[PDB]
Structures are given as structure tokens and as C-alpha cells.
Subunit: 276 residues, 4 copies
């Protein structure tokens, strides 16, 4: 099965499909162990986590591809990738982004209508460029739109429907904060709709049962694990500096035995003995 096929199979069998952000290869394997069928490479995560930069379009295609290759070399879960507006203003840049994502093992990408937004025609054209570039048609192109906050609900639908006619497989509407609005949007666009349930934003923490009731097909948790990981790391750094030892934070740590199980350390001995 190709990555795109695994992504489409996951959307078809989980309602809605939980897609969890994985900041690195290690966390991709934790997400797999936890039972998730699909994982996410957050652009904000590549910026804030891998580069220690804010999410202001400083991160480019090479930075993201490094994290895509690391993740997909060890974890076979389908990876949805944030590619912002396509890493360059030209149809040729969007095309290079698509071909690179497919070669480095991504399952899907979302591309957004950020330049305020571009015209329905100009968003339609980024999608057409992406669909044309695609060498494996199972690879999923998800249109991300911030049209609800700028033009109103019907404009959001119109634009999403134009992206679908352009060959977008799924829709990611931004800044949508009522279940009743998701249900109307989902009926009007037809294709799978993703609900972005991040923390500390305008959206309520909608449950999978609530989103299922509103006919939402995907639920994304873009940075959740990253946020808990940073609080836990800061706690260790504070304690080592304050106490001159890690004695008082040992109880917060993954054990060496747990780490050896999560990266399948003993499968490597078991491979040596099978071959030789």
C-alpha cells in the first residue's frame, strides 16, 4: 500500500480519523504504539521544534523534508505534511514540493490560501499545479482555507467546492468554532473535512463523538504532544540547575527499558541472528 493509500484507507475506516502531530521520528513511533492510524508534521512544529523559530515562513521545503524523511524511514503510518503555501510563489515551486513530498514518503499535504488570502482563482491555480505535479494519484492534496474569517460561510463553501473541482481530495477549513457550522460545511463540500483541534486557540476542545455527529471526517491534534514535551523538558532543566542533580525529576522520566521497547532495540539483535 502506498502512503496515500494508507491515508485514504484510514479516513475510510475511522470516523473521524484522529491525526496526531509527531514532532520527530521517536514520537511517530509512540503515536503508532498508542494505536493512531495517521500522523502529522506540523509547520509550526518544524519551525518551533526543529529550528527553534516562530511560524513566520522562515522554515522552507528542505527543513520540512528532513523531518519527513526521518519520520517515514522508521514509521509506516501515513504522514500528513503542512507545506504552508507550497514553498515559493510559482507553479514550479508547488510542483517541486509535491514531487519531493511523494519521494520522501509523505502520504498527504495541506496547502493554504495565505498570500488576508488570495482570490478563489489564485487558490484554485495552486491546487491545479499540485494535482498536475502528482506522480502517484493516491497521494492526498488537502486545501486549507481561511475564507470563513474573511468572506463568510457561503464563500468558504464556494472556494472549497472550486478547490474540489480543481482536484483537492480533502478540505481543511480554518477558524471554525461551532459543530452546527461543521455539519453544514461537510454536507456542502461532500469530500472529507478536517477539524483542527489545537489548544489555547478560539476552537472548543470538540470530542471525536461530537465531530462524528457533525459529519467531520478527520480531527487534527497538531502540537499537543510537543506542548507536554516542552513543559516536561523545562521542568528537568529547572531541577538540574536548582538542585545540582536530576534526583528530584527521575520520576518524570521514560526509563531506559521503556526507551529500548519504544525504538524496538531488541529487534536489531533478532535481525542479526535471523540473517547470520
Amino acid at each position: 500500500l502506498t502512503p496515500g493509500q494508507r491515508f485514504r484507507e484510514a479516513v475510510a475506516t475511522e470516523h473521524p480519523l484522529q491525526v496526531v502531530g509527531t514532532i520527530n521520528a521517536n514520537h511517530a513511533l509512540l503515536a503508532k504504539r498508542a494505536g493512531f492510524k495517521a500522523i502529522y508534521l506540523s509547520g509550526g512544529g518544524v519551525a518551533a521544534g526543529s529550528l527553534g523559530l516562530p511560524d513566520l515562513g522562515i522554515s522552507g521545503l528542505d527543513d520540512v523534508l528532513t523531518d519527513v524523511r526521518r519520520i517515514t524511514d522508521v514509521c509506516d503510518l501515513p504522514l500528513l505534511v503542512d507545506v504552508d503555501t507550497g514553498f515559493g510563489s510559482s507553479a514550479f515551486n508547488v510542483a517541486r514540493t509535491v514531487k519531493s513530498m511523494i519521494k520522501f514518503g509523505a502520504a498527504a499535504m495541506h496547502i493554504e490560501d495565505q498570500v488576508e488570502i488570495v482570490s478563489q482563482q489564485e487558490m484554485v491555480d495552486r491546487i491545479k499545479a499540485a494535482v498536475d505535479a502528482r506522480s502517484d494519484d493516491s497521494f492526498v492534496i488537502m486545501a486549507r482555507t481561511d475564507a470563513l474569517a474573511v468572506e463568510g460561510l457561503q464563500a468558504a463553501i464556494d472556494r472549497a467546492c472550486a478547490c474540489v473541482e480543481a482536484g483537492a481530495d480533502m478540505i481543511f477549513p480554518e477558524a471554525m468554532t461551532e459543530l452546527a457550522m461543521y455539519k453544514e460545511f461537510a454536507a456542502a463540500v461532500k469530500v472529507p473535512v478536517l477539524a483542527n483541534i489545537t489548544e489555547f486557540g478560539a476552537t472548543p476542545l470538540f470530542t471525536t463523538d461530537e465531530l462524528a455527529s457533525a459529519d467531520v471526517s478527520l480531527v487534527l491534534y497538531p502540537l499537543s504532544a510537543f506542548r507536554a514535551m516542552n513543559k516536561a523538558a523545562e521542568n528537568v532543566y529547572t531541577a538540574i540547575r536548582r538542585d545540582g542533580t536530576q534526583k528530584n525529576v527521575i520520576d518524570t522520566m521514560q526509563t531506559r527499558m521503556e526507551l529500548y521497547d519504544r525504538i524496538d532495540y531488541h529487534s536489531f539483535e533478532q535481525k542479526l541472528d535471523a540473517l547470520f
Copy 2:
């Protein structure tokens, strides 16, 4: 201003012992700097297990490590000590490429070890000579890591360590040293700064900076401590989301958006544009 190696030497000169914390990525390098550490570390076990999701069995290569060196040192000015395993290839040419690359990508220090079981004292000394000869900035620190204590005993470790120092090694990292009296004897004999590796769940006890200072240890390394806690916290988030169909029961464990914006200096970007424009 100072070179990375100069900052590493100044840190060792002004902190007794110098706490050096593992930073799995650029974000955690900034957290360590905020916590007040003067030096940071790029664990090769952490590049393998964290960046690659692989065991620490020499699968990870120079290019995996250099990616993480460049990410960290592009945004964090703290001196970065880098695990380079045995130099990423058996040849003096391979050791030289590693050294010139670490320096070009902005590393302050590397440790290179005598693992294969250890190689002969002569082969370890040759590794150190190749590293020293390749060094283009003399301030860059070459730290010799030896497992000679476990394989051949204390006196053999001392002799191997002194031969590495005669070969130009700036600092020594003895592995498997489990008693304070052994640190004190070793430090008195080798003369150059000694690093104590205080990792968790191993045979080494969790010695405090006070204890290590009394044993005349110059550096204490906490190589995967933050990473270990990061992984348990991420696993607890994944488990809760899967079970509950929401992250409701793990919101309390999370760094806030406002906290994150503060730790990556989000508002310095607005203020840079104000200054230019």
C-alpha cells in the same frame, strides 16, 4: 565575539563543575539557555533515538548529527559539545572530515571514543592526532572518551588518558566511573578537565555538583535527562487522546501558546522589523 570553543573553555573556566545538559533539538537548546546553563550537549544516542527513532548502534552518521548541530547552533549561541562516536569512519581522513565539519557547522567541542572492547592505546592516540591535525580553530575542544576503566582498570585508563593529552586532547571523558574516589584519583593524574557522565538508570550514581566538585571533576553531563521526560509526557498525551477522543485530560501538562511564543522569542521578530523598517 568569542568562538564556540572559546565559549566552551570559558564555561569550564567559570563553573566548577560545569553542568552540560543534552538538548535533543533547537527548541530545547533555547529552554536550556533560559534555565541558565552555559553549555549544551548533542547526544549521539539522542540523534539516533530522538531524530531517527533508532537504537544507538552506529546506524546514525555524520550527516544526521550535522543536521542537528546546524539547527541548534543557528539559533542558540551556547557552546555545543557533540558526540562524534569514533569519528564516523575508520580512517584519519574520516576523522579529519568530522572535525572540519563540526567546526564549520558551529560546534564548540566534540568527544571521540575508543570503542570498536576498546581499540589499542596507539589506535586511540592516532584518532586524537588525526582530530588535532584537522582542527582549523585551536579553540575547538577535542575531548577523548575512554572505556579503558571497565576493560583494563583505573591505571590503564590514566595512562591512555595521559597519552591522549600528549596527543593534544583538551579534556577527558572516562566512562563507567562509579566511585567519587576514582574521579578524584583520575582528575589528579590526567591534569586536564575531566567530565563525569551522570546519566540515569545506569551503574553511575546520581552524584551532585557538590560531590563532583569535591572529586575535582570539571564537567558534569546530563546527556538524555530532558529527552526522557519529554517522551513520557508525549506518550501520556497520545494515550489520553486515543482513550478519551479529546486532549481535555492532558491540557494541564502542556506548555501554553503564550509560554511557547516567549521561549522562541516570537515578539523579537516583530521588533526586528520595527528596527530595520
Copy 3:
């Protein structure tokens, strides 16, 4: 079709199949236009051409994979890649080499018995490692042996046969100076044999006709294009420094117009009209 299927297809339908060294993406397009069915990434070429270094094992997996991705992103000819001894002494290292070459678009690789050579079992163990790692069985694993130089022709046949047993798809014996030796080697091993025909070596400059009558399946020209490129470049630099102008060497230059045709500049314009 997969790159490996395309490479086996080429061996099967050209006798012997000519495989030319392509030092960069530009020269891979020139080789495709010149009508070749297969191309080659020389490890000596990555070293001397991409890194400006001697072929002394300084170049490693990431140097080669950069050149693989550059070539395979724009040229669809099956690419045979020189991977030395596997870029690390462990079966884990050989596994990561195989999996990365498949991922980054390579069609085949050769792996050799250099340490003087390793024992037959130690060479069998590399091949079993590579074969076990192969995600796509169409991907070609070519065993390269220097056993004829060290242990005589009967050893060379024996080692080759033991590599074929281990799942090596094709054999690359090193430096045969007589067609009779090649004819015997081909008949003993059964699987396709590769004749390395480099310049300024001990080997004669055998023709496709000669090697076809010795039952040789591939013929490699590893650095031919590169050696002519370097003399031409050196001639340009010498003239510019001597003359204070390039006037007297413009006659040896590919024109702008030819370059534009060789990198299909105008097809990028014909994509802008067909898409928008």
C-alpha cells in the same frame, strides 16, 4: 514501472546494455538524449567531481544520496549506484544504504568485497544484509568482486556463485583483460555480468560487439563524460587567465540555445499555458 524493473528491462533488451557515468543531473539528461537506456553514479565521481576528493572512502552515504536525488528528480533512466562496501561495516549500515537508495529513486547498486578483500562468507553476509533490506525486489543488487586479482579465476567464479546464492541479481567482476575469461565467467555464474571499461586502466577498450560474443550483459563507462568535461573546463580557465577574455574558447562551448534545449527550458512555458 519501478526504477529496478526499468533497469532489468534494459539489461534484457540490449546486449550488452551500455551504462554511462553521469556526474550530475545535467549530464544524466544529455545521456538520455544521446539514447542510453541506463546511467551510473560513480563513487570515484562523487568523490572527485562533487567533493573534489580522491576515491579513498571519505565520501559517504549522504554525499552519494544528494547526487542520486538530484539525478532521479529530473531523469527517469534507471540509475546504477556505486555504494562501496555499504557505507558502514554493520549489516544495519548496509540495510540503511539499500532502503535509502530505493527511497531516493536508484534502480540498482553495486557493493564490493574490499576491506585486500574480505572472506567469501563475509562477502555473502553483506549481500544477505542488502537482500534482506530490499523493500522492492525489482531493485537490483549487483555483487562486485576483486577475487580474480587476489585468489584467481576459479575463486572469482566460486565467490560470485555464492553471492548469486545469497540473492545478488548481477555480478561485476573486477578488471578482466581477455574476452575468453569473460565468456567462461558469464557461463559459470548464469546471471548478468558487467564489464567495467574505464580509460587509462589495465583493461583493453573492448567494443559492445566483442563483449556480446563473450556473453557480457552490461558494459560500464564510469567516468568517460567527466574526464572530457574536466579537460574542456581546464581549457576554458587557462584561456581566460592567459587572454583576459574567453574570446578564443567560445568555439568549444555549448550555446545558450543548446543548454535551453538540453534542460527543456521552453517546456516550462508550455506548462504555464496548458495549466493556466
Copy 4:
């Protein structure tokens, strides 16, 4: 000496300083052997040589940095690098480009006012962002303008003068074709002026004496060696396909002995015997 100090020194001791295109690390060493004091990484050559792509802004920062690192790892001549418009539209992208070029060991970069061209103030903003990001003031920021061809000679001089006020160290006027105009321009802008003497374009093949008389401080041969290298390689591919052997083109090849001398093969044994 830092790389930027080496470029600055070369400009003050050669009138005009010849700067030649080097497509790869091998050709940077050929340039050094030729006695050039400075070398150039063409953006068009990264695209056409390294990627086999047209020069339409498909190439990005990571493609360029790979070649910068390869060249500056073996060759100590100051490298001038083409960074297009800075690889992203924001001050932060330009700042990342500058810091990367300095870290990977580039001596200088040229950044251009292309979009048609941006406003004088938008170009000044690019230069201020690059100057502000510079950690090593010895690193040379050269402003490239196509103002002459859009707005005329006085416009181009005013723009070049505003870029100098913003900390631009040198100026690269595009599509300038009369020595008289070079001479006027050089007198007006005061800082060193580069003349781009590429083949098969509008500009005459002006000599170093001719450019010196016009008070031009640098002359660039951006792709000269690469054009010769492509024609040479193609001739090898055609001859191998037709003849079924490279025998009839051996005389156009750098010999093995010459290759080993140009990559200093024997300095590696001599390094070994000195060390151990």
C-alpha cells in the same frame, strides 16, 4: 583571514579581479590551479548543472548551500554566491540566507532587485536586512540591479547609490553593454563595480584592459567552463552510443594521472606518513 577578507584583498590587488564560474568542487580546484584569486557559484549553474533545471527560481537556499559547502570544504579561494532575491520575500528569509552563506564559508553574495523590478525602497530594505544579519562585517554584500534596462542609467545609479547608503559593499549592474556607461557608473557609485561577461548575450567580450580603462573592479565569467564541459560530455555520449566504445574520444579526456594531480591524490599518503 576570513573568506570575506580574501575577496576584499583580491579586489584591491587585481584590477580588474577575474572571478570565474565553478560548477562543482573539482572545477574550483581547476580554477585555483589556473591562478584565479576568486570563484563564483552561478545560480543558473546550480539550477542547470546541479539540478538539470531552468533558472526560473525552482532552485532554493538548500540546493545552493550544498554546492557552497562542497566547494569551500576543499578550495580556500573566496566564493561569490548568487542568492537570487534572498530565497523568500521577508527580511527574515534574507537574514537566514546571509547567516547560512557565512556559516557554510561563502566570501560574498549578490542579491538582486527582481520581482520587472521591486521599488528602490524594497531593494534598500533587502540590503538593510542582509547587512543587519551579517555576523562577520568582512563578508561582502553586492547589490545586483536590472534598473538600467527598466528605468535607465540615472535610475540605476540612484538605486546603486541608495543600496550603498544601506551598506552594500559592491555593485553588479545587469545588461550594461558600453565601456562608456561602465566608466560613468563606476565614477558615480564609488564602490567596486562588477561586469558580467557571459557568452551568447547582449554584452561584448570586453578584455581586462578594456574594463580596467572603464574603472570596473571585478569581471565575472559565470558559466564559461560549464558550457565547454557540457559540449565535451555530449560528444563522449554520442561517440559511445554510435561507436560502441569510447576509444575514438580518448584524446578529449583528462587522463587518470592528470585527475590524481588536480585533486592532490598524493597529499593524502603524505598526510598519513607525516601523522603516523
